[PDB]
Amino acid sequence: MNMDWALFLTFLAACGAPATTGALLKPDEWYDNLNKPWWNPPRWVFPLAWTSLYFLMSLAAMRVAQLEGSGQALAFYAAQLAFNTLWTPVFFGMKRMATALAVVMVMWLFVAATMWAFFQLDTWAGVLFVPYLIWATATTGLNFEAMRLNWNRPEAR
Amino acid sequence: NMDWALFLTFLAACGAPATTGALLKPDEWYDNLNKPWWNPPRWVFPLAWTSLYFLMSLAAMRVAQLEGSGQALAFYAAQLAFNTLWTPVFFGMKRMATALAVVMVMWLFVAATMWAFFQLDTWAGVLFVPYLIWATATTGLNFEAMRLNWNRPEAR
Ligand code: HEM
Ligand SMILES: CCCCCCCC/C=C/CCCCCCCC(=O)OC[C@H](O)CO
Ligand SMILES: CCCCCCCC/C=C/CCCCCCCC(=O)OC[C@H](O)CO
Ligand SMILES: CCCCCCCC/C=C\CCCCCCCC(=O)OC[C@H](O)CO
Ligand SMILES: CCCCCCCC/C=C\CCCCCCCC(=O)OC[C@H](O)CO
Ligand SMILES: CCCCCCCC/C=C\CCCCCCCC(=O)OC[C@H](O)CO
Ligand SMILES: CCCCCCCC/C=C\CCCCCCCC(=O)OC[C@H](O)CO
Structure with missing residues (x-):
């Protein structure tokens, strides 16, 4: 078990895809109109939190990928990263709050x-x-x- | 050699990029764009991507059972994440220049x-x-799409 930089940089580069969805996010008036829970963090907190998580999850996958029998674990890892990438465009881009709840679950x-x-x-x-x-x-x-506290428009059938 | 837990996990992972296609079918904005002469018809894309999701999940299932597969599965996670990213950038946000970087x-x-x-x-x-x-x-x-529609602001 070592710091494998080829593994770590590959997993970190993989986190560039969900990081891009946050980067393409402009200040949204629809989001600032939404009634939010009192414990909703300010907007600037989220990019700092996700950057930390990308490094933590990439270091974790780097350790597992060096271990015998890690196939199922890395299959789960690919699945969580893909749905992580899917959620931000569904909630913020398409403003489909109901589907975004299904995606994040x-x-x-x-x-x-x-x-x-x-x-x-x-x-x-x-x-x-x-x-x-x-x-x-x-x-x-x-x-x-956010869905429970606000008005929700019908999505595409 | 079907590890059904492995294959179904990889297949379920492809539900994320498949969902982006379902929630973002090409609308009239796509039909108005100038197309290359070799542009395939609309029905080709769901047939191609459905086949590829099954093919790539079967391949990953075989690799995931093998000694030393860590780097290969790291590459697999990377391609799948950027695969999921492309459709919202091109069709949802209509950021054609950024989408080219994503697909590359x-x-x-x-x-x-x-x-x-x-x-x-x-x-x-x-x-x-x-x-x-x-x-x-x-x-x-x-x-x-960018070279044939450069007079559109969304292409630059
Ligand atoms: C990484 C790149 C791409 C991904 C991941 C992707 C994904 C998908 C998926 C999964 C579908 C099927 C959705 C469904 O059957 O419900 C689809 C449909 C489609 N996509 Fe893409 N695609 C990509 C590139 C492109 C490009 C480059 C174009 C055009 C320039 C395009 C145009 C279309 C069209 C025309 C359809 C079918 C429309 C219809 O069914 O009426 N796609 N895409
Ligand atoms: C053949 C032997 C193996 C060779 C392997 C070669 C392939 C490796 C390619 C890496 C591209 C790097 C992609 C990096 C993606 C980072 C995404 C990004 O830049 O995000 C930053 C943005 O500011 C945040 O939103
Ligand atoms: C031991 C200390 C270790 C420090 C580690 C580096 C610190 C990086 C930033 C962390 C902020 C996280 C907390 C953010 C909470 C914000 C809550 C808020 O609403 O901020 C209101 C304030 O008025 C705003 O102007
Ligand atoms: C209120 C919340 C604020 C939180 C603010 C604190 C942020 C700390 C972030 C990361 C800690 C560093 C974690 C470093 C983990 C490294 C694991 C690792 O690298 O182990 C692999 C090893 O290299 C193989 O031998
Ligand atoms: C093209 C998109 C198609 C989308 C639909 C694809 C089919 C999904 C099927 C089942 C859900 C997947 C469930 C995840 C696999 C569960 C089996 C498993 O993880 O096994 C546990 C392991 O044995 C413990 O060590
Ligand atoms: C276009 C249609 C898109 C379809 C959308 C995707 C479908 C996802 C289905 C089920 C996810 C199940 C979540 C995985 C839960 C696995 C739990 C489990 O098997 O536990 C094993 C154990 O924890 C390990 O050691
Ligand atoms: C536009 C640029 C187009 C670039 C097009 C090339 C892209 C992929 C590069 C090399 C493929 C070679 C992969 C296989 C490398 C050797 C594999 C091997 O050693 O054995 C294979 C098989 O198991 C028994 O021969």
Whole structure:
């Protein structure tokens, strides 16, 4: 088990795809009109939190990818990253709050599945995913409260 | 050699890019764009991508059972993430220039995955060859969309 920079930089580069969805986000008047829960963090907190999580989840996957029998864990990891990339355009771009709740809940399950599978192979890789699952829980709560506290337009049938 | 837990996990992972196509079908903005002479008809794309998601998931299932597959699966996660990213950028945001960068990075990771798969399993690499071909055609379509519609602000 080493700091494998080829593995780490590949996983970090993979986090460039969800990072791009946040980068293409302009100040939205529709988002500032939404009634938010009192524990909603300010907008500037989210890019700082996600950058930390990209490094934590890339370091965790780097450790697991060096271990025998990691196939199922890395399959879960690919799944959570893909649905993570999907969520931001659905919520902010398409303004489809109901589908975004379904997307982030699927992301949550794959984040939980990755964390569990990581714990089976390496305790530190599982520990590194714990703040991710916590943040995914708060993100699911923010999506749920935003829909429950605001007007929602019908989406495409 | 079907590890059904592995294949269904990889197939479910492709539900994220498949969802982007379902929530963002090409509208009249896409039909108004100038197209390259070799532009395929609309029905080709759902047939191509559905086949590729099954092909790439079958390839990853074989590799994930093999000693030393960590780097190959890291490349696989990278190509899938940028695969999921492209449709919202091009069709949702209509940022054609940014979408070209996205699909070119995806192409590199698709090629890197194919190379890494060949190092572990010949059949897994073969299954990725039509993906790299289609990713090449996809990059050309993104490039031709910008070059044939440069008078549109969304192309620059
Ligand atoms: C990484 C690149 C791309 C990805 C991941 C992608 C993804 C998808 C998917 C999954 C579908 C099927 C959706 C469904 O069946 O419900 C689809 C449909 C389609 N896409 Fe793409 N695509 C890409 C590139 C392109 C490009 C470059 C173009 C055109 C320039 C394009 C135009 C279309 C069209 C025309 C359809 C079918 C429309 C219809 O069914 O009526 N796609 N895309
Ligand atoms: C054949 C042997 C293996 C060879 C392997 C070669 C392929 C590696 C390609 C890497 C491209 C790097 C892509 C980096 C993507 C980062 C995305 C980004 O830049 O995001 C920044 C943005 O500011 C935040 O939103
Ligand atoms: C031991 C200390 C370690 C420091 C590590 C580096 C610090 C990086 C920034 C963290 C901010 C996170 C907390 C953000 C909370 C913001 C809540 C808020 O609403 O801010 C209101 C304030 O008035 C705004 O102007
Ligand atoms: C209120 C919240 C504020 C939080 C603010 C604090 C932010 C700390 C971020 C990261 C800590 C560093 C974690 C470093 C983990 C490294 C794991 C690792 O690299 O292990 C692999 C090793 O290289 C193989 O031998
Ligand atoms: C083209 C898009 C198609 C989208 C639909 C694709 C099919 C999804 C099927 C089932 C959900 C996947 C569930 C994840 C796999 C569960 C099996 C598993 O993870 O096994 C656990 C392992 O054995 C413990 O060690
Ligand atoms: C276009 C249609 C898009 C379809 C959308 C995608 C479909 C996702 C379906 C099920 C996700 C299930 C989440 C994975 C939960 C796995 C839990 C599990 O199997 O636990 C195993 C154990 O934790 C490991 O050791
Ligand atoms: C526009 C640029 C087009 C570039 C087009 C090339 C892109 C991919 C590069 C090399 C593929 C070679 C991959 C296979 C490398 C050797 C594999 C091997 O060693 O064996 C394979 C098989 O298992 C038994 O021969």
